[PDB]
Amino acid sequence: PQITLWQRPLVTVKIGGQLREALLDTGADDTIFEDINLPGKWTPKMVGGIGGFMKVRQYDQVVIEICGHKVTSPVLVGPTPLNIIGRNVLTQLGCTLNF
Amino acid sequence: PQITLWQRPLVTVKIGGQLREALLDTGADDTIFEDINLPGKWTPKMVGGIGGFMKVRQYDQVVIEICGHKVTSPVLVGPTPLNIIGRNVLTQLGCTLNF
Numbered sequence: 001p002q003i004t005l006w007q008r009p010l011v012t013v014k015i016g017g018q019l020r021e022a023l024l025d026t027g028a029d030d031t032i033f034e035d036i037n038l039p040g041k042w043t044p045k046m047v048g049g050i051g052g053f054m055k056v057r058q059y060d061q062v063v064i065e066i067c068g069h070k071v072t073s074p075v076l077v078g079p080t081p082l083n084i085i086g087r088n089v090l091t092q093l094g095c096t097l098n099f
Numbered sequence: 100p101q102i103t104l105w106q107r108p109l110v111t112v113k114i115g116g117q118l119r120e121a122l123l124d125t126g127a128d129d130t131i132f133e134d135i136n137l138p139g140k141w142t143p144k145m146v147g148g149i150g151g152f153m154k155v156r157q158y159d160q161v162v163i164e165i166c167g168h169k170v171t172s173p174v175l176v177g178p179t180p181l182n183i184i185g186r187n188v189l190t191q192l193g194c195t196l197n198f
């Protein structure tokens with residue numbers, strides 16, 4: 001799969017049984033979702049961004065079905081404007097930037 | 100050039116005669132710098148991010164030297180935490196996401 005960038009690189013994901021859309025985001029260290037409810041215990045973290053910070057929940061060892069790949073990662077949950085797939089998951093898909 | 104994602108995809112760039120480090124950011128629609136001053140008139144714009152919004156200046160037709168390439172693009176200047184290269188400049192590099 002080669003994906004150009006004339007449009008936002010959005011992919012469909014299955015995460016914790018739910019169907020979501022998310023953004024392939026090389027500028028994100030960590031994968032974060034807004035519109036989901038994950039099972040289990042969590043750890044309080046924070047994420048900093050272009051315009052400020054926000055409290056999040058880190059859920060460890062979460063199954064994500066993305067492109068043809070099935071992967072586990074810690075997932076942050078909080079009020080991001082869009083679901084984002086970050087370098088912790090991108091690296092596991094063997095994702096690379098080419099030019 | 101093929102770049103993995105185990106570390107932040109940071110690149111050196113010459114922009115408006117100044118040397119900067121910036122992030123290849125497929126999750127960013129637009130290109131934005133924090134630690135520069137560009138010449139000329141500008142248009143007030145805003146950007147929204149993970150944690151909120153901020154006011155920025157859009158400078159049109161700015162020359163950026165990024166890896167081997169020399170391109171023009173509108174550039175946003177404002178209080179971002181890092182410099183980011185977004186899809187408006189990535190497309191001009193013929194940059195793709197591969198896996």
Ligand SMILES: CC(C)CN(C[C@@H](O)[C@H](Cc1ccccc1)NC(=O)O[C@H]1CO[C@H]2OCC[C@H]21)S(=O)(=O)c1ccc(N)cc1
Nearest residue numbers: 027028029030049050126127128129146147148149180181
């Ligand atoms: C969140 C996206 C929808 C958009 N963001 C681009 C994104 O890549 C930022 C880019 C970014 C990077 C560092 C600091 C601020 C913004 N990364 C980010 O928020 O990542 C957070 C999640 O993991 C951590 O990794 C880096 C910060 C954490 S954004 O910075 O807010 C943004 C929004 C609009 C434009 N034009 C350009 C950038």
Ligand SMILES: [Cl-]
Nearest residue numbers: 061072073074
């Ligand atoms: Cl994991």
Ligand SMILES: [Cl-]
Nearest residue numbers: 160171172173
């Ligand atoms: Cl231009």
